[model samples]
Target chain A: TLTENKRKSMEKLSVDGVISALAFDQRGALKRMMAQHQTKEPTVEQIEELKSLVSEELTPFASSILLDPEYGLPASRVRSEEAGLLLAYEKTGYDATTTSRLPDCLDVWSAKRIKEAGAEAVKFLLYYDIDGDQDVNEQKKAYIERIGSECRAEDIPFYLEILTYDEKIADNASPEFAKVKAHKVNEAMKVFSKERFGVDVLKVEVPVNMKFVEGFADGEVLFTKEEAAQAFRDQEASTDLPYIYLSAGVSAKLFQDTLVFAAESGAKFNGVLCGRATWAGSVKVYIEEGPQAAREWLRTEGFKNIDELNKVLDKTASPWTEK
Target chain B: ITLTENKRKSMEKLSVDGVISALAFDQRGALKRMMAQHQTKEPTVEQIEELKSLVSEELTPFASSILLDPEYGLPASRVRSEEAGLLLAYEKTGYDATTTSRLPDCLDVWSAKRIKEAGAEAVKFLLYYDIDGDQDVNEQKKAYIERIGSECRAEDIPFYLEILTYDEKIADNASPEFAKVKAHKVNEAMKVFSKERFGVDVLKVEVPVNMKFVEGFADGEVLFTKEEAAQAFRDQEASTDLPYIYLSAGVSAKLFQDTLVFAAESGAKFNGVLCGRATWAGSVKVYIEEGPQAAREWLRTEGFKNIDELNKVLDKTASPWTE
Candidate 1:
C-alpha cells in the first residue's frame, strides 16, 4: 500500500488502484495535428474546445485524466467528477537548445501552483540518453531530481515519463534501434526509480517496439517470441516503484494488444495512461464536422477503446495497491 | 440542464423572485494573496479548497447560488447546499500583469457551452474596464467581451457580465477622487454592454460609489454627501435595461449592507447581489491560524451571520431580475 497522502492521491487517479488515466496533455504536436486537418492554424479556442469535448466524453470511463495546464485547465474542470486530475509540469518541444534537449518547466506554473489548479499528481516528461554526452546526461539527471523534490515538498505524486533516446538514430522504430530498445528502456526505468528522484509512479514505455516483436508483426522481427516475453519480465524486474504503460503514439488496438502480451509474459505493470490511441482518432472528426460530431465519435469510438482497455486491465493488470 | 427546459430555466435557477443572492468565492490570485498576509507562507492547494468548501457548505444556505471559478470552486460546488445553483467564472483571474490595459481573457480551455455543461446555470466573466482609457485598447476588450457574450447566447445560458472600473491616472481605485468619478464610469459601461450586440442577460456591477468615503459612513473625509450618494446610486439604475446586480467589491459586511439599504432608499432598482469578500474574507484569518474545522465552525456562526444580514437587507429592498 502507498503512504497515507500518496495513496489517497493515487486512488483519485485510478480505479481500485489501477490507473486508466486518459492523457490529453499533447500540446505542440496536438496543434500541429490540428493544423494539418484544417485550412488555417488551429486557434487556442479550437484546441481548448477539443480537449473539453474529450474530457466530457472520455473521462467517465477514465479513473483520472492527464492534462496540461497550458490549454487543459478548462477541460480539467469539466471532466467527470469521479475522475482525478494530473497536470503536466514540463513544457512541450523541449524549449531547450538542440539534442542535449535540456528540460524546462512552464514559467508561470510551480508544483504548488499545479496542485492548486486541482491536480492529484504532476506529470514530468524527461528525455534521457543513457550513453550520450556525459555532461548532458548529468544535467538531465539533476533536472528530474530538482522537480521531483518540489513535488515531494508539495506532497503531490510525481509521475515521471522518461524516454530513452540516441542522437545517432532518427527513427526509434528501426530494427537497428529496436535491438537495444528493451535494454535502454529498462535501464532508464531503474535510474528514475531510485528514491532520490522522488518518483511516485513510472509511466513506462512497453519494453520492445511491438512492430518488430516476433509473432505480433507482419514479416520482419527484431526479437524472438520468447525474447519478447522475457523483455517484459526484465521490465518488471528493473523497477520496484509502481508503474503504468504509455501508448507512445501507437494505435488503440496495437496498444491494447501489446498490454495483453505483457500480461501473458507475467508482467504485473499497474495499468495504462493511454493517449493518442483512444482520442487522437477524434481530432479530424472534430475539425471537419465540429464539436457535436467529434463528441459522437468519441462517445462511440473513444468509449469503445477505453472499455476494451479496461476489459484487458481487469484480466491482466496488477493493482499498484500492492506497490 | 436542458435546452427545451433551458430557454427560461437559466435565470429561474439563480434567483428567488428574480433577485439573485449569490455568494461570490470565485477569487483566485487575490484569494491567495490575501491568505498569504495572515500566514508566514502562502496558502496551499487543499488549504484554499478547504476554505471555499467551508464557506459554500455553511453560507450557501442563505444564497440563491454560489458564483465560483471553474479552477478552485468545483470541490466547493459538490458540498454546497442543494438550494445553491452554480455560476462559473469563465475569465481567468490573472495573466500577463505587464499590461495596464486590463486586457480581458477567458480560461484558456473553457467556453460558455462547456461551463453550461459543467452544471452551471450561468457563465460569469469578470472584465476590468478603464472607462476613460484608450479607445483602441478598449475596443480590443469590447471585441473579447462581445465574443463571450455570443458564446453564452449560443449555449442559451445567462451571461453575468461583471464590470470593475478604474481611473488610469489614479493609483488607488477607492480613493475619494476616484470615487467622485465612479458613478459616471459605471454608468458608461452599463450603457455600452447593455446594447443588444453584447447579448448580456444580467449585469453584475459595483454600487457606483465607495461606501468608505460616503458622508454618513466616512469618519474623516467624505467624497459625497448623503444626498449626493443617492444620486450616484440612482444613476446606475438609469444606465441600463438589463437586470443588474451589485458586487461586494471587498467592502466590509456592515458597509456593504448599509450601501444596499442606502441604494434602496435612494430608489435604485437592483436585482440583489453577487457578493464576495464582504461575507467570507474575514474567515481567512480563522482558517490560517486555526484549522479547517475551526474555520468551518467560525463560518457556521460569523460567516453565516454576515450573509444572513445581507440577505435580510435584500429581503427588504433587493428587487427581482427584471427590466
Candidate 2:
C-alpha cells in the first residue's frame, strides 16, 4: 500500500542500496555490560553519553543509526546529520519467566510517535523459537502483525529484528545451541517474510555461529566451511524482502568475517545493523576511565570498526532496493 | 503523569509568554470562495498557493506560530520564519456537505506522523461540531474525534482542536438567528471535547456571540444588547477547565479586535486566537486585483499592523495557557 513510502525511507537508510546501518538501540544489555566496571547501576545520563559519542563518531561511517528513546533521545539531537534514524519500538527486555518472549512496545511510544520524533523507521525486536510451542509462537506472530499494521498506517518502514532462541536451551551461545542455530535462523527468515507480517525489511543474525563453523572456529568445529556457506545461502533464499545481518553482540572482526563468508557463498543479503561489535570495545573504557578516554578510543578503534565493516558491505552486500 | 515530555516541548514551541498568538492560514475551500468574491475571474490554483506563501512570509515573523494547510501551504511553510513554530492542518478541507452528518476526513496522504515529519510543531484538526445534532450522528463525531485524539496522543504532539458549531436546521451560522443559540452551542461543544478521552490540549473556538449582533461591536445588525453579549461570553468561560483560544471566523480585522476587547472586558479567560482572515483578508482583494507583489506591499504595512495591534491587546488582556 505504501510501497513508495517504504522505498524512500529505505533509500535514505542505505549507501548505494546497502543498509550498512549502525545499531546502537541496546538498553538493558548495554547497561548490564557497563555494570561490569561500575559498582552502582549505570545512570540514565551515563548510557546517553555513551550512545551520543557513538552516534557522533560512528554515524558518519554508516547510512543510518538505530537508537532507543529511553536513553538515546538526547543522543538523537547530537548525532551526525548524515545518518537517518531508526527508533526502537519494543521495550528493552521482557521478563524471562514469560518464556514465550512475547514482545511489548515501549509504554510511552507507538510507531506514530517514533515517526513524530523524526525517525525514518521503527525497529521492533522479537525473540522467536522455531521449534517452540505452537500456542506461544502464535502469540508472538500476532504481536508482530499489530506493530506491522501500525507501521503501515504511519507510512514508515518496519525493520523487524528476530532473535532465534529455543525453550529447551539455557544458553543461546553454547555448543548445544550451536547445533540448531542455522536451522532456527533460516526458518525464522522464512516465517516472518510472509505477506501477513507486512514487514519492509528483516534485521537478523548470520545463520552460522562463527565460533562453531569451520575455518572460523578456534575449536569444536560444528560445520565445514562449505557447509557454513550453504547455510548463509539458505537463509538468503528464504526471503524476497531485503534482509540485513545484525552483529548479535559479536566482535567487529568476526561480523566482518561472517559477511565475507556470506558473499563467498553467493548469498545476496542486503547489509548490516552491526552495533556492539563496533562500540562495545569502548564501554569498559567509558565506565572505568572517563567520557574523554572513551571518546578518544572510539575515534580510533570504533571508527575503524565501522569503516572496515562498510568496506565489507560495499564489496559483499547488495543494495536493499534491488530485492 | 498528565503530560509527556515530547508533547510538552512541542506545546512550548507553539506559544510565546505561555500564550499562543497563532496566525491561521489553513483555509482551503473558504479561501477559494474569498478569492472568487473579490476578483472578476476565479483565481487559478497557482495564484491561491502563491497568495498563501505571500501571507506566510510577511506575517509569521510577528506571530508565535502559523496554522497552515498541507495541500497549498507546504511552500508557504518553507518560507515561514525559523523562530515561528508551525501547526499544520490535518482535516480534508471542511466536511462533506452532501451528508448532514458533516463527517470529518483526514487528508488521504497525511497522518499526525507525516505532519510532524513536515516540520509541524503541533497538529491542528478542524471539526464541524453541532452540540445539539442527532445523537447517532454526534456519536459518530465523538468516536471520530476520539480516534484523532488517540492519534495525537500516540504521536506525542499537541492536538489543537478547532470546533465550528453549526445547526442543521438554521440557515446561516454567522447570522443573528443562529447567534441566539451559538452561546449554548459553543459552550456545550467545549464541555464535550474537553473530556480526557478527546485528548485535546487546546480548543480553537468561535466567540459565543456574533460580533455583528453584539451591541457595541455591531457593524450593521444588532441582536444582543451589550450586557447580554457579555453574559454569553461569561457563560462560555465557565464551560470547561481546558484552555481555549478564539477563531477569527472570517471577520474583518477591526471587528475581531473589538470582539476580543469585549471578551477580555467581560473576564472571559481565552488564552489567545488562531486569528486567520482578520489579520490578512484585506490582502485577498489586493492579491486578486493587483497581483502578489501588491499583496506583499499591503501585508507589509496593513498585515503587520493587524498583528501588532492584536499582540498589544493580547499582552494586556489574555492569560497564559499554563494558568
Candidate 3:
C-alpha cells in the first residue's frame, strides 16, 4: 500500500522535501476550510460527526501510525481532523504514520482511529527538542502519560524516540558530524524515560559498524579502542532501559569507520532502523539500491546477520584490560 | 522503726547537699558561700530539675582548669572550662560558633545550659595549658587541673585537658636551658596524667610535624587526642572521627581524605583533629566531611532530590561544599 505509485509525488523534496509537503498540504486545507466556513459555520455536532467519519475511514487501513509528538498542542498532533477522510482506507491490522509536520487538530481523529480500528499496536514516533531545552521532554512525558493511560485503560502500545538535533540553519547551533555522540543521545533518552512517561521500547540511530566505518573530520581513521571505550562509557552512564534501536541518517556514506566502530564496539542495542540513510537517493533508487546497501554495510561491519547486529555491542570490559 | 527526728534530719541533709558541694569546690570555697548567702539562692523548679539532670549526667568526667604563674593570667575557672567544652560540643554537631579560642570562663556553663535547652546530646571540653618560659610548669599544671576538676565535680560539668610544651623566647628571654625546660614540662604533664587516678576522658596533645600519627592508636590508651588547630593549605590532608559529634551532624567536606593519621608520638587517644577553617564559616561546614565527591553525593542523596529541596535547609543554614 505504501508503494511508490500510491505515495504522493514529493516534488523536489531535496532536503526541503518535508517543508514543501507541509506547505502544500496546509495550503490546500486552508483554502478548503475557508470555502466551507464561508457558506455556514460548522456546528459542534457537525464537527464531531466529521471527526467520527474520519475515524471510520481510517480504521480500515490503520488504527495507529508512527507520529512524532510535538509540544503545546492537543494530544501533541501535527495534522488536523479534517484530513481524516484520507484515513478511511486504513482499516488493516497495521498502518505506519509519521509526522514530518502535523497540526494539533489531528489528535481527535488520530485517537478516534485508534479506537475504531483496534490495531494490534499503535506507536508514537516522538523525538527530542531541537534546542535542548528540557521543556519538550516534560511535555512529551506528560503527553505519553496521558495517552498511555488512555491506552492501558483500553490496552495499546506507545513508542518514543530520544533524538538530539544540531540545526544547520541556526548560527549558534553547531553541527557535530560525529556519530559516536549517539551515546550521549542515548543517555538523554534514558533520563527522559522516567516513571511519569514510562516507555516500552525506544528508537535510535543505526551505529556504524566495522566495514562501513569512515574517516574522521580531519580525514584520519578514528576507530581506536580508546575512542570506542569513551563512547561506551558515555552510553553506560546515559540511560537505564531494556529496549534500544539504532538508526542512521542520509550522511552515513562518509563516516565508514564510525559504522564499523559502532558494530565492533559491541554496545548493546536491540535493532537498527534508518530512513534517509537507507534511501539517500530517489524512492525508485532507494527501492532498488538501499536495502542491499544497508545489508552490505551491516555485513562489512562484522555482523553476520540481523541477529548478530542485535547482539553486537560496545565492550563491557575495561578499556585497559588485556583481551 | 526509724525515729521521727532522724527522718527529718535526713530529709534536710538531702535538700542541702547540692549547696554544700558547690561551696566546697569553689576557689577557697568563697564563691560557693556567696551563692549560699545570696537572698535569691533558692533553686527554682526548672533550676532544680536542671541541676538534678546535670548531676546525673555530667559529674563523672569533669576536670579542672590551669593558670599561668607569676600574675600573667587569671585562673581558668570551672565555669570557663565548662564553657569551652560546651562550645566544642555544639560545633561538632553542625552548630555555628567562633570556636578558635578557649571557651570564655564567664560563659562556659551558661552556654552549655542554653544549648542543652535547644537539644545538644553531650558536651566536649578541651582545656589548654600553655607553659611559657619563666613559668613554673610543675607547680602551675598541678594547681590548674586540681582546681578545674574540683569545680567540674561540684558543678557536674565534663572537662577535657590538652597539654603541650613549647619554648617561647619572648617570655623566657632565651634561657640557656630552654629546650631542656620544655622537654621537662611535657614530661611532667605526661607523668602527672599517667599517675592520676582522676578521670580524664580526652587529651589534646601536640605532636611534632614529622610525627606519623597512626601509631598512637594502640591498646590501653587512656584519652582522646585532637589537633588543637589547623590551616587549610597543608601539603597533606587529614581525616578522623574526632570533634565527637554530640548531635552527629557531620559534614562531608571536612572529611574528604580517605584516611587521616594522628602521629604516633601525639601522646593521647589521638582519635582525630579538631579543625576550624573558612570552610566552617558558613553552610560549607555542613558538608565539611564530604570532601568534593561526597559533597556532590550529598546534594542528591536518597531524599534531597533537587537543589531547591536540599537548599530548603542548607541554603538558609550552611552547606559550603554543595556547589
Candidate 4:
C-alpha cells in the first residue's frame, strides 16, 4: 500500500486533510440558489457579495478548490496552492424545471477557450448511470474519451466526476434506492478506473451505508458493520487512480461521518472535494438571517467541518505527493 | 437602380420615408471593446447581458432597426429587440469572412433556423459585389446568396442583401471620371443581384459618388459638381426594382449628410438608409477614449442628430414595403 511505484502523476499539493472546497456553480445553480432564498435571478452585486465571502473565508482551509466560469474567475484567481477549474461540457435545463433528456457534450469553441485559459487541472462533471440504457452510456463514454484526448493533447490534467442517477431512483430518494445506487457506483468504478480513460483523479460518491436499508425492513439489521466496511474497500479497490468523495448535497455531519468511516475501514481514499455540505448551511443562514450571521457561520461551522474531515483522513493514504 | 419584377412584388409591403436613424453594430467590435474595459479576453456572462442592455437602451430608441451578431449577442439581444417592439436584424456574415471574400458561405455560422428561433425580423448579408470579377467568381457569390435566400424563405424570415464593391477597382485614383464609372459599376452590380430569383427582400447599398470628395468636399476643392451628384443618384436608382437603402462606409458626417440630401431630393426611388460609421463612429471613439458613460451620452446626442438630419430629407413613399 505504501509502494512509491504506485504513486502516479496527480497534481502535487501539500495536503494535511481531504483536498476539498465548495464547488462553485454557474447561472442555473445560482438562480436556483436565489430562488431558495425567495429571490428572483441574482443581481451581479449579489453574486459578487456571495463569491467575495467564499474567497475570503473558504479558500484558506481547503487543499484544492473548483470554480465555474465568469463570477468564479475572480475567486479562482485568488486560489493559493492547488486549484482546479470546473468546465461542464454539457448544458442541462435549469434543475427541476424540465424533463427533456438532453445529450451531454462539449461545445468545440468553448473547449478550445477553456483549454487556453490553462488551469492546473480541468474537471468535467457529467451524468452517468451504469444501469441506464447502454446506448446512452456509450454516448457519455465517447464524450469523456474525446475530452480526455483533448486534455492529453494540450498537456493539461483531467479530473472526472461521474454522477449516477436513473430519474425514478433519484427523484425519490430512499434506503432501497441507496442499495441500488451503491451497486451502480461499483459498476462504474470497474470500467472508468482504467488508466486508458486518461483520468488523473476520480471524484466519487461515498459508498452507501447498508444500515440505511434496515429502517425500511422489519427490525432486522440489513448488513453487519464488517460487511459495510468490506463494501467500502471493494469500491476503492476497483480503481488504481486516487479517489475522493463528494458530499453531493448530503448534510455536513453525514458527510463527515462517511469520510471517517471510509478512512477507518482502510478504504484507500485520498481526500474529499465536497460542496454544499461544507457551506450550504452558512449560505442558508446568510439568506435567512443576514450577512453577519452567515459570515459567522462560515468562520465557525465551516472551519469546524473542514477540521473534522482532516482529522479523520487515513494516515497511510496517498497524499497526491510523496512526503 | 433596376428593380426586377420579383423585387417589385417583394417590396410591396415595405415602405420607407427615410432610414433616418442609427444602425448599431454591437456584435463584434462593441462587444470586444466592452470586454477590454473589464480587462477580460472573453465577455463575462454579465458583460454579455450588459452589452445587450446597451443595444436596447442606447440604440433601439434611435434606429428603425438594429443589427447584431448571433454569436456575440447570445441571441438574447434578438429577444430583447422583439420585446422592445423594435425590428431586429442579424449579421449573416462575420468580418473575417468579409475580408476573405467568403461572404454568403460564412452564413453557416449564423444559422437561419437560429435567427428564426431568436425572433429576428431579418437577416443581413454583406456580399462582396464586384462587377469586374470573372463570371465564376461572381457566380459563386450569387449561388451562396441564393442558398441563404432559400434558408431564410424556409424559415419564413426576410433576407436583406448588402452590396459592397471590390477594393481593387477603387483603390488609388479618385478622379471624378473614375468615381463616376465606379458609381455606375455599383448600380450595374446591384441589377445583377436584386433579381427576384435571388429572394433578396431588401437591398442595402453603398452610397454612389461621382468623386472621392466626402472627406473634404467643403474644405478642399469640390471634385464633383452638384449636377454630378444628381447623376450618381439617378445611376443608383436605375439598378434595382427592390427597395434599396444606403450604408455609410465611414464617410465624414458632412459628406454623408450631403449625400443623404442629394439622394432624398433627387426624386429617385430611394426607400431609406442604414448608415453605420457615419452615425455612431464618434460615440465609439468617445467610448474607447473616455468611457461607457461618455459614449452613451454622445450616442444620445450626436447619434440622434445624424438620424434627424436624414429624417428631414427622407421621401415618405420610398420604403422597402408599402405602407
Compute each candidate's TM-score over C-alphas: 0.52, 0.54, 0.27, 0.47
> Per-residue lDDT of A63-91 in model 3, one digit per residue for the tens?
12222212112211333332211111111
Clash list (residue pairs), candidate 2: A17-A319, A17-A320
- Clash counts per candidate, in order, are 1, 2, 78, 22
Per-prediction DockQ comes to 0.01, 0.02, 0.01, 0.01
Fnat across every predicted model, in order? 0.00, 0.00, 0.00, 0.00
Tens-digit lDDT track of model 4 for A1-323: 22231122133322543355456554466656766875655566666566657656777776566665555566666655454444444453325553323244322223334555545556777666677766566555645654554445344566787666665564525666666766777678777876445576788886674335333223545655666777788787787767777877777777776666676767777777677777777656766676678778878997787666566554434565432
Worst 10 contiguous positions by lDDT, candidate 1 chain A: A94-103
What is the lDDT for A75 in model 3?
18
lDDT of 1 by residue, B33-132 (tens): 9889888976898887888888988998889999888878889988888888899998878645566777776664565656776899998998888888
lDDT of 2 by residue, A113-193 (tens): 788888999999999999998877866775676567567757789899999998989888999998899889999989999
Q: Which candidate tops lDDT?
A: 2
- Candidate 2: where are CA atoms >4 Å away? A1-323, B38-42, B219-221
Model 1 chain B weakest lDDT span, ten residues long:
B1-10
User: Model 4, B51-127: lDDT tens per residue?
Assistant: 45554466555455665555555443544433232224444434443243433433222345455556556667677
Task: List candidate 4 segments past 4 Å from native.
Answer: A1-18, A81-112, A167-172, A209-221, A289-293, A314-317, A321-323, B1-323
Any idea what lDDT model 1 has?
0.84
